[PDB]
Amino acid sequence: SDLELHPPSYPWSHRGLLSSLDHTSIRRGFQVYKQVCSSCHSMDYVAYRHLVGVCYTEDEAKALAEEVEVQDGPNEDGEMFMRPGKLSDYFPKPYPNPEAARAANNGALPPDLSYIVRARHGGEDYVFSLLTGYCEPPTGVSLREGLYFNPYFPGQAIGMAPPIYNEVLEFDDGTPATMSQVAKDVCTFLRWAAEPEHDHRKRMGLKMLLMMGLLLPLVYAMKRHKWSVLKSRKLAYRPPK
Amino acid sequence: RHRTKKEIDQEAAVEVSQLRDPQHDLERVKKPEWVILIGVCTHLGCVPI
Amino acid sequence: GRQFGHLTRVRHVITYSLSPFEQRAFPHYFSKGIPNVLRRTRACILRVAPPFVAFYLVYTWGTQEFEKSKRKNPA
Amino acid sequence: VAPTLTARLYSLLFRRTSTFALTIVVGALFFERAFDQGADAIYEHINEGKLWKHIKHKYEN
Amino acid sequence: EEEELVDPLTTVREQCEQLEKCVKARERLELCDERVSSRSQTEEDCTEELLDFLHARDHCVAHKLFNSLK
Amino acid sequence: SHTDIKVPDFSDYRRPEVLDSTKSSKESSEARKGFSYLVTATTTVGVAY
Amino acid sequence: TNIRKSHPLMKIVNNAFIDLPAPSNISSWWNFGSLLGICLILQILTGLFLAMHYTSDTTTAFSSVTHICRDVNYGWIIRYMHANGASMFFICLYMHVGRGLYYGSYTFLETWNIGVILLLTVMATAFMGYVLPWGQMSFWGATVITNLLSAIPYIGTNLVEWIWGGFSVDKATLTRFFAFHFILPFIIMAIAMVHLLFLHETGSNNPTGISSDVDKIPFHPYYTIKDILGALLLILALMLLVLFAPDLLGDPDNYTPANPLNTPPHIKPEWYFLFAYAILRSIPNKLGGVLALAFSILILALIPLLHTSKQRSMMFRPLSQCLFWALVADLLTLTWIGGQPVEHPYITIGQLASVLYFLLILVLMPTAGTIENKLLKW
Amino acid sequence: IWGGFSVDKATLTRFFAFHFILPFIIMAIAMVHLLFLHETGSNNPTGISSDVDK
Amino acid sequence: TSDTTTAFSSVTHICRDVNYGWIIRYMHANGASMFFICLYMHVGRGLYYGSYTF
Ligand code: HEM
Ligand code: HEM
Ligand code: HEM
Ligand SMILES: COC1=C(OC)C(=O)C(C/C=C(/C)CCC=C(C)C)=C(C)C1=O
Ligand SMILES: COC1=C(OC)C(=O)C(C/C=C(\C)CCC=C(C)C)=C(C)C1=O
Ligand code: FES
């Protein structure tokens, strides 16, 4: 309450200026989103086709969309039926009205995930330190049995239960689902959903630095060459008498 | 807002003549344990926390 | 307005110039160059620097007082 | 093969503004490709996280 | 849960939590912890000493953590 | 008297290929324009990209 | 005759960028005029492409902004170039005004006064810009700001409600702000031309503050290329910002959609208004705060009347230099304070810095000029 | 110019933006129009020069 | 509003709800026609009178 603590500096694999994302790690993080987070977290801005260029393939991405039902457009009767799932749809699912989140979790909304990393202060670090760093209430501060404890939270009265060690998973090739590990991946994926352009931008940024490093001296030399006439000009004053 | 016994007494003990807008607490409420206000600040319209 | 040939009156001043294709764009660049920047720096530090450190100090102190204030021992 | 070098460039291509332009346009074309691939490969090396993984999932289509 | 999965967090946290800066902060934690237990009508509630301990620990956590994580 | 009008030494600024009063400038002219135009050509190529 | 010199259209170009007699000694600091020129066009161009997908409706405002960054090809750079260009526009704007102040350039009354109108206009422009994404900071920024006008006696309530288009910052208010944010930069441009029109009656000032008719050079090889080299430096700064740190100067909260019930603890402007913001809240008064907020900008119109020195520039005036740098240092303090809560230290330092700002410009700087004159026996 | 295979969402918004900026450009051109017009002044019904009676 | 969802509706919103929104809307619509009547007179005037020689 009016006192707070700031997150450390975790060495994410996408922390460096010219550093890509671990695309294998965005997968597992999507997996973490899919089962765990999804039941309460809306990711209104990401779609299935968005994953294609990133992690999975055309085929795989289709299939994952097919494991849900959407509520497609009306036909002849003015209906509202159900459809397998395209690639075209997004991930808006949890529940309709924001009030339903409140009715459920209790007067609290699991804030939409699509923009989280970019909306906190501290990026993935705030979220990682939150998820991983759950602890126990010290002296004299009682809660409200729905208000769990997290040091990395404004006021420290949070409405979210710690859902990171519930070891679910399909780390395909073979990756242990420890609290730490599921958290890196979930945040690595979150970075991506908040900033999908992330990699491509750093590729352009790399090129921007190389171009500039070539262009800057050259334009400078062009300009110095033209200013030469003036820099070495010599004056003399020769009055009468 | 539901006010406790302690808060009702504290507002009634406030030196009225030193206030920017002179008003007693009892002319701002009908029942002493209930204060109803608009969540809009008179300066620039923010919401008081 | 303005133009050239209508600016002002000038007498008895010669100006020797040399073509850009006959001279170097960066003559004593590091040689005469760096000494000049140091000299330009000397000339100006006492006028630019002080105001800024006064802020630098007011900034670090200001932050310390604020953060140290939200803590408390007795009473 | 050094004094006569920039001399030839000037003689054969920079004198006329015709060739001068033609050369930078012909020079913009090749350069684009060489810089693009050359910089992609530098972005490629410092990483190895994106589509190097492709070999797995796909092919099974 | 009961016994079976080796949390790298827990592993590296031990070595971390231990160390000098945190030993001292936890000392004040416990010091202040035991004060609040020893009374009734008090309110100096130990929220601060916990965060200081956590900070020192967590900085060391980050530095040494991710290395092992695969 | 206008015959006293010197022409200040520019050796301090002259490119190396033009340092000798003993020989032509025509020889190094091509290399000299070559070098300066290469700079602007490379630049436009850069900007084009 | 030529073609450049005689053709009605080319004349204008020739007289402004080719044969224009320019002082031979203007330095970087003189580049910010062309750089503002580039920033103005950059803001218009990326601004237009964004308008081709942006929706001015509260229902889809944020979504359309999101639609741009994920779906629209290269929509993201365009969006960040816009956002960061607005900041680049303020860094250049501030260099430019400061350059004018240090160097005495303000003695060109019309040019400078037009410049003040240009400052106000891009400020009014950028404020309306930031509201468009309809983020939490957009809405609460829009709220805190407009409501200031309610301090104007007898007319203030009706005035605020008139520009709101209701009793709050709602539907009517967003669409409204779109329209004005679209038309303002064009008007700015017409004014930038009048700015340049008045500037041409005298030509440029220079570092020494001494007339340069005695040594002018054509703008035609010298300043075309120096402006070029300089725009390249503006591109570097902008691109460094957008391709590596696009949110560095941005507020992570404007990423959460507007919520007229959720007041963030935060609540601060974009950095370019932080100094004025600090001056505003330093005053324990509704009217005075906004009266002094306004005065912290409109004071630039009083500057030429407070010139007191017999020399034009500051190049030869040491005492004045110190006072100038203390103004810039005081403006760092003001922005820093403006970006901080109104609790301990911060209140009294931001209160005293506000007094200093006005003591400096209004009393200290003039007094220094008189002293300096005296030391020189003038 | 459609922003798709039909006149859709992309196409309407697009058309708004261009319909907003075009009249300003028109104005700058109307000024250049008037600039060239000024080199001679106006013509008149007879098509004969009027310098003699302006 | 430039969105297909509310484009027509916003135009309707203007004529019923926005104070004096209707005249503004019709002045716009009819002004566009007035702009073409004037445009056509202007070009024709130029043609008849030889003004195009500028
Ligand atoms: C590992 C998957 C999850 C992640 C990454 C996640 C992440 C987050 C984040 C970043 C916040 C907001 C932090 C802030 O406001 O500063 C949040 C709030 C919340 N989440 Fe989760 N969450 C996940 C799964 C869940 C689940 C399964 C539930 C259902 C128990 C849940 C219910 C909540 C609630 C109620 C809040 C609001 C807390 C409050 O503001 O009072 N979340 N979550
Ligand atoms: C849209 C904003 C502005 C634009 C496009 C603009 C453009 C320019 C240009 C192109 C120059 C000539 C080159 C230079 O010295 O930089 C200039 C000089 C000047 N401007 Fe601005 N400027 C703008 C804002 C301002 C502001 C905010 C002021 C101060 C109120 C200002 C007052 C001046 C003055 C006094 C000069 C003459 C400086 C001198 O010659 O030493 N202008 N401006
Ligand atoms: C007439 C040319 C301009 C047009 C058409 C234009 C249009 C837009 C549009 C549609 C948005 C909302 C999309 C978005 O937020 O990215 C926006 C945001 C903004 N614009 Fe402009 N604008 C123009 C010139 C300016 C100018 C002159 C400035 C002042 C430097 C400016 C500063 C801003 C700012 C600060 C934002 C909000 C921050 C952000 O990018 O999210 N723009 N503009
Ligand atoms: C809510 O956050 C805030 C902003 O961001 C939206 C601002 O922009 C400003 C200052 C803005 C302006 C236009 C001051 C200039 C006034 C005049 C009369 C020139 C303040 C104070 C602020 O609190
Ligand atoms: C001699 O002093 C001057 C310069 O050297 C410091 C300039 O660089 C410029 C550059 C101005 C440009 C390119 C016009 C931009 C304006 C708009 C509206 C796009 C001008 C006018 C000038 O007088
Ligand atoms: S204190 Fe200014 S709006 Fe509340």
Architecture of domain G1-378: Up-down Bundle (1.20)
Distance from CA of H38 to the nearest CA of I (A): 10
Q: How far is CA D11 from CA A150, D19, F31, F32, in A?
A: 75, 10, 9, 12
Q: In the annotation, is G34 catalytic?
A: no
End-to-end Cα distance, chain I: 43
> Does the beta carbon of G172 sit less than 6 angstroms from any atom of ligand 4?
no
Q: To which H or E segment does residue I29 belong?
A: helix I21-49
Q: How far is CA A92 from CA A75, A86, A103, G100, in A?
A: 22, 14, 18, 54
Measured distance CA(A236)–CA(C14) in Å, rounded: 5
Measured distance CA(A18)–CA(G211) in Å, rounded: 50
Q: How far is CA A163 from CA A38, A117, E12, G317, G337, in A?
A: 12, 18, 21, 67, 39
Resolution of the entry in angstroms = 2.6
Opening angle at CA E54, ends E49 and E60, nearest 5 = 140
Measured distance CA(I8)–CA(I2) in Å, rounded: 9
Measured distance CA(I54)–CA(H40) in Å, rounded: 8
Are residues G304 and G198 in contact, defined by beta-carbon separation less than 8 angstroms? Answer: no
Opening angle at CA A170, ends A168 and A174, nearest 5 = 115
SS3 E48: helix
Taking alpha carbons only, the member of G354, G330, G315 closest to residue G99 is G315
Are residues A237 and C13 in contact, defined by beta-carbon separation less than 8 angstroms? Answer: yes
Taking alpha carbons only, the member of G246, G64, G258 closest to residue A195 is G246
> Which residues, 6+ apart, have CB-to-CB distance to A218 below 8 Å?
F39, F42, F43, F46
Q: To which H or E segment does residue C13 belong?
A: strand C13-16
Measured distance CA(G345)–CA(C58) in Å, rounded: 10
Measured distance CA(A126)–CA(A10) in Å, rounded: 10
Are residues G323 and G368 in contact, defined by beta-carbon separation less than 8 angstroms? Answer: yes
- Residue A234 is given by DSSP the state E
Opening angle at CA G140, ends G135 and G141, nearest 5 = 90
Binding residues of I for heme b: 28, 42
Measured distance CA(A52)–CA(A55) in Å, rounded: 6
Overall residue count recorded for chain H in this entry: 54
Are residues A230 and A69 in contact, defined by beta-carbon separation less than 8 angstroms? Answer: no
Beta-bridge mates of residue G23? G216
Measured distance CA(F19)–CA(F34) in Å, rounded: 18
Taking alpha carbons only, the member of A111, A156, A106 closest to residue A135 is A156
What domains can be seen in chain E, in order of their start residue? 1-70 (1.10.287.20)
Taking alpha carbons only, the member of G338, G308, G314 closest to residue G326 is G314
Distance from CA of G162 to the nearest CA of B (A): 15
> Which residues, 6+ apart, have CB-to-CB distance to G165 below 8 Å?
G171, G172, G173, G176
Are residues I11 and I29 in contact, defined by beta-carbon separation less than 8 angstroms? Answer: no
Domain extent at residue C52? 1-75
Taking alpha carbons only, the member of A4, A24, A12, A5 closest to residue A117 is A12
Taking alpha carbons only, the member of G244, G270, G174, G212 closest to residue G24 is G212
Task: Count CB neighbours of D10 within 10 A.
Answer: 21
Minimal Cβ distance to D49: which of A20, A60, A207:
A20
Taking alpha carbons only, the member of G27, G33, G370, G369 closest to residue G212 is G27
Q: Best residue in A3, A232, A234, A241 to probe C by mutation, most C CBs within 10 Å?
A: A232
Number of domains in chain C: 1
Measured distance CA(F47)–CA(F44) in Å, rounded: 5
Are residues G213 and A171 in contact, defined by beta-carbon separation less than 8 angstroms? Answer: no
Measured distance CA(D43)–CA(B30) in Å, rounded: 71
Q: To which H or E segment does residue E14 belong?
A: helix E8-18
Taking alpha carbons only, the member of A9, A25, A2 closest to residue A129 is A9
SS3 G257: strand
Are residues A151 and E54 in contact, defined by beta-carbon separation less than 8 angstroms? Answer: yes
Distance from CA of A227 to the nearest CA of F (A): 13
> Does the beta carbon of G39 sit less than 6 angstroms from any atom of ligand 2?
no
DSSP calls for G28-67? TTSTHHHHHHHHHHHHHHHHHHHHTT---STTTHHHHHHH
Taking the mean position of all CA atoms in its chain, how far away is CA G269? 14
A21 to chain D: which residues are within 8 Å by CB? Answer: 49-50
Assigned token pair, A104? 């459920």
Interface of F with D (CB under 8 A): 17, 28, 30-35, 37-38, 41-42, 44-45, 48-49
Are residues D15 and F41 in contact, defined by beta-carbon separation less than 8 angstroms? Answer: no
- CATH classification at residue D17: 1.20.5.260
Beta-bridge mates of residue A47? A90
The ranges of chain A annotated as CATH 1.10.760.10 are 1-196
- Which alpha helices (DSSP H) does B1-49 contain, by range? 5-12
Comparing alpha-carbon positions, the chain G residue that sits nearest to C10 is: G214
> Which residues, 6+ apart, have CB-to-CB distance to A13 below 8 Å?
A19, A20, A21, A22, A25, A188, D49
Q: In the annotation, is G330 catalytic?
A: no
Are residues G142 and G134 in contact, defined by beta-carbon separation less than 8 angstroms? Answer: no
Assigned token pair, D28? 């913009």
Reduced to 3 DSSP states, what percent helix, strand and coil does chain D have, rounded to the nearest 5? 70, 0, 30
How many helices (H) and strands (E) in chain A?
A: 8, 5
> Does the beta carbon of G189 sit less than 6 angstroms from any atom of ligand 5?
yes
Q: In b/e form, how buried is each residue of A51-62, taking b as 16+ CB within 10 angstroms? A: bbebbbbeebbb
Measured distance CA(G62)–CA(G58) in Å, rounded: 8
Q: In the annotation, is G372 catalytic?
A: no
Q: To which H or E segment does residue G140 belong?
A: helix G136-146
Number of domains in chain F: 1
SS3 G21: strand
Q: How far is CA C5 from CA A230, G21, G216, in A?
A: 19, 10, 11
CATH number assigned to the domain covering A1-196? 1.10.760.10
Q: To which H or E segment does residue D5 belong?
A: helix D3-9
Q: To which H or E segment does residue A132 belong?
A: helix A124-132
**What phi and psi values does residue G84 have, to the nearest 5 degrees?**
-70, -25
Breaks in chain C (C to N > 2.5 A) come right after: none
CA of B45 to the centre of ligand 6 (A): 6
Assigned token pair, A142? 């009682």
- Exposed/middle/buried for residue F4 (C-beta within 10 Å: 0-12, 13-18, 19+): exposed
Taking alpha carbons only, the member of G341, G141, G335, G143 closest to residue G253 is G141
DSSP calls for F1-49? -GGG------TTTB-TTS--TTS-SHHHHHHHHHHHHHHHHHHHHHHH-
Number of domains in chain D: 1
CATH number assigned to the domain covering A197-241? 1.20.5.100
Measured distance CA(F24)–CA(F12) in Å, rounded: 19
Domain extent at residue F45? 2-49
Q: Atom 36 (ligand 1): residue with closest C-alpha?
A: A110
Beta-bridge mates of residue C16? A234
Measured distance CA(B42)–CA(G283) in Å, rounded: 15
Q: How would you write chain H as a 3-class SS string?
A: CCCCCCCCHHHHHHHHHHHHHHHHHHHHHHHHHHHHHHCCCCCCCCCCCCHHHC
End-to-end Cα distance, chain F: 57
Instruction: State which amino acid sits at residue G214.
Output: V
Assigned token pair, E41? 């009508």
Measured distance CA(G295)–CA(G304) in Å, rounded: 15
Instruction: State which amino acid sits at residue G363.
Output: V
DSSP calls for G294-342? HHHHHGGGTGGGG---SSSSSTT-HHHHHHHHHHHHHHHHHHHHHTS-S
Looking only at Cα atoms, what is the longest distance across chain H? 62
Taking alpha carbons only, the member of A149, A152, A156 closest to residue E54 is A152
- CATH classification at residue F9: 1.20.5.270
Residue in the block written with tokens 């203390």? G326
> Which residues, 6+ apart, have CB-to-CB distance to C68 below 8 Å?
none
Measured distance CA(G108)–CA(G198) in Å, rounded: 8
Assigned token pair, G62? 């944020």
The sign of the dihedral angle between the CA atoms of G101, G188, H39, G14 is: positive
Q: To which H or E segment does residue A235 belong?
A: strand A234-237
Measured distance CA(G362)–CA(A35) in Å, rounded: 65
SS3 G22: strand
SS3 A236: strand
CA of G236 to the centre of ligand 2 (A): 22
Are residues G62 and G136 in contact, defined by beta-carbon separation less than 8 angstroms? Answer: no
* Resolved by: X-ray
Assigned token pair, G347? 């209140």
Opening angle at CA G372, ends G370 and G377, nearest 5 = 95
Residue in the block written with tokens 């484009």? I7
The sign of the dihedral angle between the CA atoms of I7, I8, I10, I15 is: positive
- Residue A57 is given by DSSP the state -
Assigned token pair, G215? 């040594």
Measured distance CA(G2)–CA(G4) in Å, rounded: 6
Measured distance CA(G65)–CA(G120) in Å, rounded: 27
Assigned token pair, D4? 């006569």
A215 to chain F, any CB pair closer than 8 A? The answer is yes
Measured distance CA(A133)–CA(A115) in Å, rounded: 21
Task: Count CB neighbours of G19 within 10 A.
Answer: 18
> Does the beta carbon of G276 sit less than 6 angstroms from any atom of ligand 4?
yes
CA-based Rg of chain E, rounded to a whole angstrom?
Answer: 15
**CA of G20, closest atom in ligand 5:** 1
CA of G266 to the centre of ligand 6 (A): 12
Beta-bridge mates of residue G257? G135
Q: Parallel, antiparallel, or unpaired: how do β-strands C13-16 and G21-23 relate? A: unpaired
Assigned token pair, D6? 């920039």
Assigned token pair, I11? 């135009």
CA dihedral B6, B7, B8, B11 (to 10 degrees): 120
